[PDB]
Amino acid sequence: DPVMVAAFEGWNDAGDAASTAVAHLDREWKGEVFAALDAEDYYDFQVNRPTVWLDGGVRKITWPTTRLSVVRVGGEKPRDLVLVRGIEPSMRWRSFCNELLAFAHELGVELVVVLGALLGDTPHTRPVPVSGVTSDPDLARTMDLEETKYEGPTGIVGILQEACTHAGVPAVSLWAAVPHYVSQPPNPKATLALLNRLEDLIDVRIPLGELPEDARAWQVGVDQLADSEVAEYVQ
């Protein structure tokens, strides 16, 4: 059955870890685009300024949006994945989510996985925690999803995962916790943590390309910053 894997830039995307995880799937598997949501309905353009680029001689415009593409995995046991690469919208989240659920429906998506990253309290000197959230009582058993204590502000990931369950489409979101003292956008170690966890859930071989090297580089890069509150945040 087809699975939708989504990720959104901005507030639910602590090191761009989640957004680059899906980018990575789209790239490695050469994903074929078939839909972009109409930015006009969702995006404040002063907050999300569109950009101009030059193609041959000519000026062209890129809008913020959420784009849908299909990848064809994988083994002798083949499969379609529906990737959703978006910026978190600034308005009409209920419609936004309905729009994705319509695609999910037309495509017969059987499971929605959403990826995110937040800033947490774990050192770089140690592996990245990934935790799930689901309101599907079935999936809660069917994987080991530890639990959810969380009460507070939520984002489009939270909203989308809830829209799914109200729709009766099984969904789970995976969260990676990124060391808050080192939060700058290139974070290969946490991207990798997400991708590994997704693989166990979906049961799909993911090609990790240059990522395992990148993450090691990052760590033996950060380690050079020698002030050690990481000692404090380990005991």
- Summarize as ranges the residues that interact with Cl ion (CB under 5 A): 154, 158
State both tokens at 73: 């995995």
Q: Which stretch binds its own copies (CB under 8 A): 17-25, 96-104, 173-181, 208-216?
A: 96-104
Q: Which of 135, 181, 219, 222 binds its own copies (CB under 8 A)?
A: 135
36 binds, among Cl ion, its own copies, none (CB under 5 to 8 A by kind): its own copies
The radius of gyration computed from the CA coordinates of the chain, to the nearest angstrom, equals: 18
* Cα–Cα distances in angstroms (integers) from residue 97 to residues 2, 16, 68, 214, in the given order: 18, 21, 13, 34
- Give whichever of 107 and 140 is closer to Cl ion, judged by the CB atom: 140
- Give whichever of 16 and 88 is closer to its own copies, judged by the CB atom: 88
By CB under 8 A, residue 53 contacts its own copies: yes
CB of 148 to Cl ion, least distance (A): 8
By CB under 8 A, residue 40 contacts its own copies: yes
Q: Hey, which residues does 78 pair with through a beta bridge?
A: 74
CB of 32 to Cl ion, least distance (A): 30
Cα–Cα distance for residue pair 12/28, rounded to 1 Å: 23
Cα–Cα distance for residue pair 15/180, rounded to 1 Å: 10
Cα–Cα distance for residue pair 201/176, rounded to 1 Å: 15
By CB under 8 A, residue 23 contacts its own copies: no
- 81: exposed, middle or buried (Cβ count in 10 Å: 0-12, 13-18, 19+): buried
Cα–Cα distance for residue pair 91/57, rounded to 1 Å: 35
State both tokens at 141: 């058993």
By CB under 8 A, residue 158 contacts its own copies: yes
By CB under 8 A, residue 106 contacts its own copies: yes
Residues that bind its own copies (CB under 8 A): 10-11, 33-36, 38, 40, 43-47, 49-54, 58-59, 61, 67, 70, 88-95, 99, 102-103, 106-107, 133, 135, 148, 150-155, 158-159, 162
